[PDB]
Design an enzyme around this catalytic site. Structure first.
Site, mmCIF file in Angstrom:
data_model
loop_
_atom_site.group_PDB
_atom_site.id
_atom_site.type_symbol
_atom_site.label_atom_id
_atom_site.label_comp_id
_atom_site.label_asym_id
_atom_site.label_seq_id
_atom_site.Cartn_x
_atom_site.Cartn_y
_atom_site.Cartn_z
ATOM 1 N N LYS A 68 0.885 -1.201 0.000
ATOM 2 C CA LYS A 68 0.000 0.000 0.000
ATOM 3 C C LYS A 68 0.909 1.234 0.000
ATOM 4 C CE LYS A 68 -3.819 -2.535 2.128
ATOM 5 N NZ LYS A 68 -4.834 -2.578 3.230
ATOM 6 N N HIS B 209 -8.198 -2.475 -6.545
ATOM 7 C CA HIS B 209 -8.088 -2.468 -5.088
ATOM 8 C C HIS B 209 -8.862 -1.285 -4.524
ATOM 9 C CE1 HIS B 209 -6.330 -2.608 -1.071
ATOM 10 N NE2 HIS B 209 -5.901 -1.367 -1.234
ATOM 11 N N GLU C 16 -11.793 -8.913 -1.607
ATOM 12 C CA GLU C 16 -11.531 -7.951 -0.520
ATOM 13 C C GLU C 16 -12.820 -7.710 0.239
ATOM 14 O OE1 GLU C 16 -7.905 -5.175 -1.845
ATOM 15 O OE2 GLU C 16 -9.814 -4.512 -2.709
#
Ligand code: NA
Ligand code: NA
Lengths: 230, 230
Positions: free
Chosen positions: B10, B80, B144
């Site tokens: 990240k 994402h 996710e």
């Protein structure tokens, strides 16, 4: 005020091998006069430039801080195309030791409506309270004629001079003559070897935020236009 | 199917010196079993990783292509946290020779409404037409649980198994058993040394897209959980 030229590579070139060849060309360029030069590049090319670019010029990020500072990078562009959000980022970047090229400029509708000076003045009025005292030496402002970029409309030399003076006037009115006299205000429309000299001669134009010509040998001509700025 | 573990750094670490120390730790890690490992990092750190990371692992961008390919980088994460827009980017990346970790997953409202399987199925149904034939070997899918990330709600091991099987079921129904049997489907919720082994043992969980533990020594424990996946 020292003339200031920033080369904004935008999303170019498409390979690191091309970036390294461009840096090699820039490293041999003979600069004339007195000018401060900065080069902004895609994030994945910033390590290459920081390592290989001539050390009398400085590397800039295209947007944002501790990550790029860990490479020794001192500059970022901000606002290149909410003003409250943008001014907050300016405050954060300056507080964390960055120098900034803060972009402003109006879109086609406001230009056609006769509201260019009102719109740009309001953008700078929102920027002004966010600059910490003692940080104005670390601020450069770029005027981007968004109304003349991809619209089929073209900006004149007089437009550049007029919109840079609008910005200087609002600095003088809100934070004083000392600040207004030191801040470099750049023209960030289309700048080429064929028009850089006449643009540089404009009294309130202190330099350029250069687009596509920053990827070409003609960048040195634009850097060297500083000799026509009084 | 070979177990697959992606470390998603990240926006971490905050300095290139810390990135280089993390790479040094990873280069000494003893991997057990059979597992494919990829590490995704901020753009300004991708050159460092591509140069210094152990060559039996692969570097990934966190989002997107010719620029990163010019460093030899073969992977990117996509999606994402519009599905039509996201699927188009998947098509573009695969057509240009990239391997992708394609992310999906539902937010809290859809989970609370009892619509998790319907929402995720529809996301994959939009992904499916965009994958070129012959490119399914270059696709990994990550679930996710956005409803369990920053919400004060936590996902169970059974939730992970259930949502990975939902994805496999819709692959089987729309593109066939051969494709459904080869595609690795990852769990991309909170994965730690304390739960990776029980998660890996789930039959439809083929690996992980790891968040904060990818920055720690515990990443090797998660990589080595592959030995509990039948
Ligand atoms: Na001038
Ligand atoms: Na498993």
């Amino acid at each position: 005020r020292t003339f200031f030229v920033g080369g904004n590579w935008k999303a170019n070139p498409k390979t690191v091998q091309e970036a390294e060849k461009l840096v090699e060309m820039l490293n041999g360029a003979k600069v004339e006069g007195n000018v401060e030069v900065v080069v902004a590049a895609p994030f994945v090319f910033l390590p290459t430039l920081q390592q290989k670019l001539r050390k009398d010029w400085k590397v800039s990020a295209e947007n944002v801080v501790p990550m790029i500072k860990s490479f020794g990078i001192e500059w970022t562009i901000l606002g290149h195309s909410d003003d409250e959000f943008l001014a907050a980022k300016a405050k954060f970047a300056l507080e964390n030791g960055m120098k900034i090229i803060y972009c402003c400029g109006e879109h086609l509708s406001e230009r056609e409506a006769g509201k260019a000076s009102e719109f740009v003045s309001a953008q700078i009025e929102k920027m002004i309270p966010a600059i910490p005292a003692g940080k104005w030496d670390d601020v450069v402002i770029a005027y981007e004629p968004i109304w003349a970029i991809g619209t089929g409309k073209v900006a004149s030399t007089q437009d550049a001079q007029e919109m840079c003076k609008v910005i200087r006037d609002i600095l003088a009115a809100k934070v004083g003559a000392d600040i207004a006299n030191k801040v470099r205000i750049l023209y960030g429309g289309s700048v080429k070897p064929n028009n850089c000299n006449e643009l540089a001669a404009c009294p309130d134009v202190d330099g350029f935020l250069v687009g596509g010509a920053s990827l070409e040998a003609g960048f040195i001509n634009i850097v060297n236009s500083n000799v026509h700025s009084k």
